[PDB]
């Protein structure tokens, strides 16, 4: 018989983020359009959530443990960040995100509990990651108001472009590769 593997959209504990996805799809589509970023050729790595309540993080953890498996859990700035690999992906446009990042509440307070950013892997030399990512963004986009850009074992330089609430990041490695680098 076909394997019974709960899809993330079927889990009671994840109903809020399932309902929050359409909003995020629009957010990413719009941000990419303003930045003049061509999404089609870019390789998806993982999608990330943000919460401000510990209870919310715990609830989502219980939910992801019903539709995925833990890839890693690391202490980042005094709080845990879990990376889960799901049996079935979170569909975002043409992308199929199999890995979800679940960070506990940290220093910065994000008012919205739900989808917040995605990370793209740009193969090549880590030393030029920032420069290569910046080259993918149009001049008009970078100069647009409200839009900002910032920078952040294996060197994992991460270039992040944002509108204030929705963010797209680029880095040299995939999560599975980072996990492998430390075994």
From Swiss-Prot:
InterPro entries, per the entry: DUF991_YecM-like, Glyas_Bleomycin-R_OHBP_Dase
Domain of life: Bacteria
Signal peptide interval: none
CDD domains referenced in this protein's UniProt entry, alphabetically: VOC_EcYecM_like (cd07268)
Disulfide feature: none
SUPFAM superfamilies (alphabetical): Glyoxalase/Bleomycin resistance protein/Dihydroxybiphenyl dioxygenase (SSF54593)
GO CC annotations on file: cytosol
Pfam short name (any one): YecM
Alphabetical list of PANTHER family matching this protein: DIHYDROXYBIPHENYL DIOXYGENASE DOMAIN-CONTAINING PROTEIN (PTHR37519:SF1), PTHR37519
Family affiliation: To H.influenzae HI_1582/HI_1581.
Record-given protein name: Protein YecM
Annotated organism of origin: Escherichia coli (strain K12)
